[PDB]
Amino acid sequence: ALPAIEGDHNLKNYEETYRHFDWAEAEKHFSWHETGKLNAAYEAIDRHAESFRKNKVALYYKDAKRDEKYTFKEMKEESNRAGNVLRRYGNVEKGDRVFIFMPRSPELYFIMLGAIKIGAIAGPLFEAFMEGAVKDRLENSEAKVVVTTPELLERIPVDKLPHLQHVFVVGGEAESGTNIINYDEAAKQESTRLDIEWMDKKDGFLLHYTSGSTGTPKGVLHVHEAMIQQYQTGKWVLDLKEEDIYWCTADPGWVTGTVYGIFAPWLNGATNVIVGGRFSPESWYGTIEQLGVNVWYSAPTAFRMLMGAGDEMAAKYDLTSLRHVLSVGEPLNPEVIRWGHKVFNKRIHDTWWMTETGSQLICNYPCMDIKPGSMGKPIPGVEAAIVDNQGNELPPYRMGNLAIKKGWPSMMHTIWNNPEKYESYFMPGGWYVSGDSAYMDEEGYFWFQ
Amino acid sequence: ALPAIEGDHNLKNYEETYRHFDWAEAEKHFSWHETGKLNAAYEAIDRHAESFRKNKVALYYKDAKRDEKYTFKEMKEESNRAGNVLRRYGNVEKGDRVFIFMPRSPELYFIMLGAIKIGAIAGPLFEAFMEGAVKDRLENSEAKVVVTTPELLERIPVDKLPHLQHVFVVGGEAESGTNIINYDEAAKQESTRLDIEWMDKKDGFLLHYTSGSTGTPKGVLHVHEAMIQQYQTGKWVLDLKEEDIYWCTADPGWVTGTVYGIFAPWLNGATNVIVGGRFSPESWYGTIEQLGVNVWYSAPTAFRMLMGAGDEMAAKYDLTSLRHVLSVGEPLNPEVIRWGHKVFNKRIHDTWWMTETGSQLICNYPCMDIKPGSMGKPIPGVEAAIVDNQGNELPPYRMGNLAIKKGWPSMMHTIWNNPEKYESYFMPGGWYVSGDSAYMDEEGYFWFQ
């Protein structure tokens, strides 16, 4: 059991906050509580650009060809420009699905934020998807607009999708066809002021496609209200301060990079770092050393591959700027935890959630001891349990299905065009079952199986 | 008489503060007041880089070839690197004179900050100086180190200066001679951590050379304590908020671009903008529109050339971001005031000071009415008057010599290696005379002649 380290954490004590927390208190930190105008994108970007965080660096893009950095004001301007481009050329209205199919780049974030600002539902696609996956995801969602690069423009079958009107191409000298629009040319002539579509807490703003047990991808829809939890988990689990440099290594194509690489940091007003190109221990360690990254959010595969690079490889670089390390996507091996404590002299914080959950649910905390191999405890305001097939709670140390009490803000609203699968996730008694096996200890800690 | 505009200014009421202000209150905003370790460079840069302003953009640089942005952390790191370079290669110790002879560039600011951090006295030279002026200024100061560029390396007579040991060259493929060190290679191998030389309030940190009435340049020495006034005038006259973009167009070679282009903004933790290349209305208006500059500090000549450009030239660009405009270096023709109020719809704030005064003394304020053509009123904590040749105050509307009561923090400590000229600036009764004629009105406003 790795002991906790004393410090000035956002969550001072877990127990009292868990016993007393109410989501109405979390709703106080947002602008719409005082004004009534609600939008996740506005809360993530434009709220800070109109505050003392206006000139704070929001985004750090490092790539071999280009090295750029943007402030909150510049991010807001680029997002407004992208939203105007989409509204004018793609004819995107509230509720439309805008799919973004490009490698990780500042334009990706600008376009995603602009799409969400104007009321569209943004769906990111992995750059490595072939023709089949792109076809299925564009057909199921009936996506109106796709934004891509010349390299991946050949992987989209425009002729096989009657519901796809416009294709935006960023970069390169792409010839604008009947349904192809060169994004940069349109953007250069657009304004930086956007009339933001004010939304309702039950309207969707993200659409993420997951590989289902039946073999067909399903669209998970998240609503704006999820930002509430996205903010709170950004403060408790990430422990984001004002002086933190935050780096999330997950791709924006997946849910992890979209939630905790875009929204969780920027809702807290943090500084986010994205790095282009493929993985290499040289590039990652050099990025950490040069940018002085304080908060790191990565995946167990990347950490294990880091382990494969050797201890001296890390010892060649200065990693003293790091202060908080977190992992997600796979239940972490405690040997990786020992290696991290041996290299960075830090505890790697394992967190658990799924695409349907919207945000992390069961996590390790800076103020809590970390038991190696354990997922941790549910966040305050969220109730979790180990239940049988009849919805009855099981005593500790008994194997069972990991269930969460229905009703947390970051819950998925539905499964796109498949209500039966949506209702298939819930058990009698208000228990959302995740299909995963876990067991609770006598101390309240959860262990995955 | 241009009326004042209501707003949330730092100086809410001029009269009450002027009647009650004491410099001991101003001393409370600095770290040294509690810690006891005093340095102007630390207060300007490293204090903010260790606060909630760590990731705030400190410097924008823009020219025809480069476009870079630096945060307070990055500025601190570059300054520490430059200080280490100077300490190791130039053998610069406390009290030495380090002269900087280069065009405006991030390297200039890094080198000047690093020199001041290690206790040296920084002296900037105008890029347009020929061999004669550089020779006189390097001989009078007995400067140990000169830092320059390959273009201006030919304008320095190394052989004629026995007191010049090292010459640093930044950029270009300069062959390192017996006394020539190429700055970039030395910097690349140096650390970003600097053991800062903690100083005393009466030690000099700036040396500025002015054209004297006798024809020979004289070295005006300013002490660290001046930062106090440099901070206060940065808050009252500049009206710097947290969300202000500050642009000073004066060259760092002169006193104006050093006090109010380096120290006054960064002591307040503001964002400074520097633009390379020659003046052109296209470049200046585009810089204002693109960066959204809020606070502007320029010179009447630069405003007059923008007059010559025409109103239709400015009407093309977006200048709504500007909220405060100030002028210095020459009495301001009030026709320029009407033109500014016509174009930017703003009041141009004229300020008066000299190289010997260290910071502005008599200014217009955001909370005060601006009488066109008047220099304004003395800052709180500074007493000014119109005196005759015998040191007696004159009644309003009578011509006389403009004198300031001796003892303000930003006073020059001495004239370098010439005490007689230093004592020649003061009259009996504690009145420092500036050699300029001005008259007071019945309302306390000063008018230059």
**Would you give the distance in Å from CA B219 to the centre of its chain?**
16
∠ at Cα A130 (A125, A131), nearest 5°? 100
Binding-site residues of A for ATP, in ranges, read 329-331, 350-355, 436
Helix, strand, coil % over all residues of chain B, rounded to 5? 35, 25, 45
Rounded CA separation A297/A418 (Å): 32
Closest C-alpha among A278, A258, A213 to residue A63? A278
Torsions phi, psi of A81, nearest 5? Answer: -60, -45
Interface contact flag, B73 A271, Cβ < 8 Å? no
Give the strand order in the sheet containing B97-101: B180-182, B166-169, B145-148, B97-101, B121-125, B204-210, B218-223, B412-415
∠ at Cα A177 (A176, A179), nearest 5°? 105
Contacts of B216 (CB under 8 A, 6+ apart): B136
Phi-psi sector, A358: left (phi>0), alpha (psi -120 to 50), beta: left
Contacts of B41 (CB under 8 A, 6+ apart): B79, B113, B116, B117, B196, B205
Rounded CA separation A263/B422 (Å): 61
Closest C-alpha among A155, A173, A161, A166 to residue A101? A155
Cβ pair A351, A357 in contact under 8 A: no
Interface contact flag, A57 B54, Cβ < 8 Å? no
Q: Locate breaks in chain B with C to N over 2.5 A; list the residue preceding each.
A: none
Rounded CA separation A258/A293 (Å): 19
**Shortest Cα distance from A347 to chain B (angstroms)?**
24
Task: Break chain A into its structural domains and give their ranges.
Answer: 14-382
C-alpha pair distances (Å), A375 with each of A333, A360, A379, A409, B273: 11, 11, 11, 21, 48
∠ at Cα A116 (A110, A117), nearest 5°? 85
Interface contact flag, A242 B73, Cβ < 8 Å? no
CATH code for the structural domain at A14-382: 3.40.50.12780
Phi-psi sector, B119: left (phi>0), alpha (psi -120 to 50), beta: left
The token pair at A247 is 């780096």
Binding-site residues of B, in ranges, read 256, 329-331, 350-355, 436
Q: How was this structure determined?
A: cryo-EM
Q: What is the DSSP string of A49-115?
A: HTSTTTTBEEEEEE-SS-EEEEEHHHHHHHHHHHHHHHHHHS---TT-EEEEES-SSHHHHHHHHHH
C-alpha pair distances (Å), B221 with each of A65, B134, B358, B415: 46, 18, 9, 6
Interface contact flag, A57 B71, Cβ < 8 Å? yes
Sole residue written with tokens 């400015």: B314
Beta bridge partners of B426: B432
Cβ pair A113, A145 in contact under 8 A: no
Which CATH superfamily hosts domain B1-29+225-382? ANL, N-terminal domain (3.40.50.12780)
CATH code for the structural domain at B31-223: 3.40.50.12780
Identical fold, B1-29+225-382 and B31-223: yes
Q: What is the DSSP string of A114-150?
A: HHHHTT-EEEEE-TT--HHHHHHHHHHHT-SEEEE-T
Size of chain A in residues: 449
Q: DSSP E strands: which ranges in B364-411? A: 374-378, 384-387, 400-405
Interface contact flag, B55 A51, Cβ < 8 Å? no
Sole residue written with tokens 């940069």: A184
∠ at Cα B35 (B32, B40), nearest 5°? 25
**Would you give the distance in Å from CA A339 to the centre of its chain?**
26
Q: Using CA of residue B395, residue B397, residue B402, residue B405, what is the dihedral sign? A: positive
Q: What is the DSSP string of B168-184?
A: EE-SS-----SSEEEHH
Rounded CA separation B380/B12 (Å): 13
Amino acid (1-letter code) at residue B309: A
Rounded CA separation A64/A147 (Å): 23
Rounded CA separation B420/B423 (Å): 5
Binding-site residues of B for ATP, in ranges, read 329-331, 350-355, 436
Size of interface A-B (CB pairs under 8 A): 29
